[PDB]
């Protein structure tokens, strides 16, 4: 039945029905056991697509809102703001969903360095998504929770994973985006991203047959952001 | 536009 | 408030939230008045995207089903078939939704040649989508209803619209796809598509400033299908 | 693959 759920998740992925993909992978996470690499990646993909669609919607709607604020479009702004607020409710629910699964199921059952760093990184990510649209105290709270999670993941990563590991590099990339976009700290963002990149360059012999393309891609993404920021 | 991890 | 609904539909379209786009445009259709060209097109776009996603899902799932039938994958086939059947229920509901709006609202309120042909063509289309996955008597019924609708649209089109009109050409394209895919009749499909194309070529001076790019595109699509079929 | 109208 675990195998049955994974197969249902893959069918949903093929069909691009990511809502159903999430439902199937939530059930697997519900079993309170260590997920395989395949299962962690399917769970990550499912939520990344479900939340990604709403974050893209929110950025579009927000750009339209900024356009009308500049034009003085008061009547449209009433509709735009209500619309944005609806999408934020969806975002909050999606984040709370995965954050509850991480807290009750995935983190407690995690028993490898890789899976622990993966789930604390995910925990940092979904608090970061909360912080993207949050205002005032809610933003401070989501940023504090994201920071704590990224620190816990970074502690385990530095002790358990080589600097070339894609989960470690992805963690560095996301944490640097966190410093830049949430904490408003380009200095800290560039330092982390450059440090992670240089540490990988120094130990390229730790690259794995399983993931070297993923590491390469992430290293390129670190370099691209650094290009943007500097 | 920043990129984050896949 | 009609203007407010149209603006909400456009915001939803921008955000790629086509479910909401449908809800807003259903409300406009509910007013029992002649829709503007802009409103007909927004209503058409909204449903085309909502049903299009499920039809794409259904074709994918069906291809996977055909692959496993050929491999002898009995255990996967139980899951594949249940999955397909779920998507067909969604398809049936979406088609019934728009078919009810056309029957109760749009067709009765239609008072131009263009809008009458547009809605009978849409009626033919959504019965055709029903027929794509229907089996046995249900397929015969959906095909009979689609045929009746495409004939009613073609009667009005031939008397009221020039052969270059995009709605008339789109009607010819869809009706020829109907003959090919539902009625299993390549002869009739090629004859209709070739006749519609040649009639437009003969009267190119009837092309409209408003729609000549749309006519050109449709003429290309007629030619492409004819290429495929012959 | 057949195309139908936009």
UniProtKB/Swiss-Prot annotation, chains A, C:
Placement of covalent cross-link Glycyl lysine isopeptide (Lys-Gly) (interchain with G-Cter in SUMO2): 48
Thylakoid keyword on record: no
Gene3D superfamilies per the UniProt record, alphabetical: 14-3-3 domain
UniProt keywords, alphabetically: Acetylation, Cytoplasm, Host-virus interaction, Isopeptide bond, Nucleus, Phosphoprotein, Ubl conjugation
Modified residue annotations for Phosphotyrosine: 129
Example GO biological process: protein targeting
Alphabetical list of InterPro entries matching this protein: 14-3-3 (IPR000308), 14-3-3_CS (IPR023409), 14-3-3_dom_sf (IPR036815), 14-3-3_domain (IPR023410)
GO MF: cadherin binding; calcium channel inhibitor activity; calcium channel regulator activity; enzyme binding; histone deacetylase binding; identical protein binding; MHC class II protein complex binding; phosphoprotein binding
PTM-bearing positions, type Phosphothreonine: 135, 230
Protein modification: (Microbial infection) Cleaved by poliovirus protease 3C, leading to disruption of the interaction with RIGI.
Pfam families with a match to the protein in the record: 14-3-3
Residue numbers bearing the N6-acetyllysine modification: 48, 67, 116, 121
Entry's localization field: Nucleus; Cytoplasm; Melanosome
Superkingdom in the source lineage: Eukaryota
GO cellular component terms, A-Z: cytoplasm; cytosol; endoplasmic reticulum; extracellular exosome; focal adhesion; melanosome; membrane; mitochondrial membrane
Phosphoserine carried by residues: 63, 208
Function: Adapter protein implicated in the regulation of a large spectrum of both general and specialized signaling pathways. Binds to a large number of partners, usually by recognition of a phosphoserine or phosphothreonine motif. Binding generally results in the modulation of the activity of the binding partner. Positively regulates phosphorylated protein HSF1 nuclear export to the cytoplasm. Plays a positive role in the antiviral signaling pathway upstream of TBK1 via interaction with RIGI.
Quaternary context: Homodimer. Heterodimerizes with YWHAZ. Interacts with PKA-phosphorylated AANAT. Interacts with ABL1 (phosphorylated form); the interaction retains it in the cytoplasm. Interacts with ARHGEF28. Interacts with BEX3. Weakly interacts with CDKN1B. Interacts with the 'Thr-369' phosphorylated form of DAPK2. Interacts with DENND1A. Interacts with GAB2. Interacts with phosphorylated GRB10. Interacts with KSR1. Interacts with NDEL1. Interacts with PI4KB, TBC1D22A and TBC1D22B. Interacts with the phosphorylated (by AKT1) form of SRPK2. Interacts with TIAM2. (Microbial infection) Interacts with HCV core protein.
Name assigned to this protein: 14-3-3 protein epsilon
Lineage: Eukaryota, Metazoa, Chordata, Craniata, Vertebrata
């Amino acid at each position: 039945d675990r195998e049955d759920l994974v197969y249902q998740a893959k069918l949903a992925e093929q069909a691009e029905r990511y809502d159903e993909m999430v439902e199937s992978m939530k059930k697997v996470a519900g079993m309170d056991v260590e997920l395989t690499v395949e299962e962690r990646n399917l769970l990550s993909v499912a939520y990344k697509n479900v939340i990604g669609a709403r974050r893209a919607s929110w950025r579009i709607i927000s750009s339209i809102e900024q356009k009308e604020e500049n034009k003085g479009g008061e009547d449209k702004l009433k509709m735009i703001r209500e619309y944005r607020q609806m999408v934020e409710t969806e975002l909050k629910l999606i984040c709370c969903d995965i954050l509850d699964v991480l807290d009750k199921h995935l983190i407690p059952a995690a028993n490898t360095g890789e899976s622990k760093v993966f789930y604390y990184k995910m925990k940092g990510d979904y608090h970061r998504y909360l912080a993207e649209f949050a205002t005032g105290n809610d933003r401070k709270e989501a940023a504090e929770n994201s920071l704590v999670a990224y620190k816990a993941a970074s502690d385990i990563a530095m002790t358990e994973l080589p600097p070339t590991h894609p989960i470690r590099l992805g963690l560095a990339l996301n944490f640097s985006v966190f410093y830049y976009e949430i904490l408003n700290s380009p200095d800290r963002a560039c330092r982390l991203a450059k440090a992670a990149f240089d540490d990988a360059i120094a130990e390229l012999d730790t690259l794995s047959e399983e993931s070297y393309k993923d590491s390469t891609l992430i290293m390129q993404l670190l370099r691209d952001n650094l290009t943007l920021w500097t | 536009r920043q990129r984050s991890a896949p």
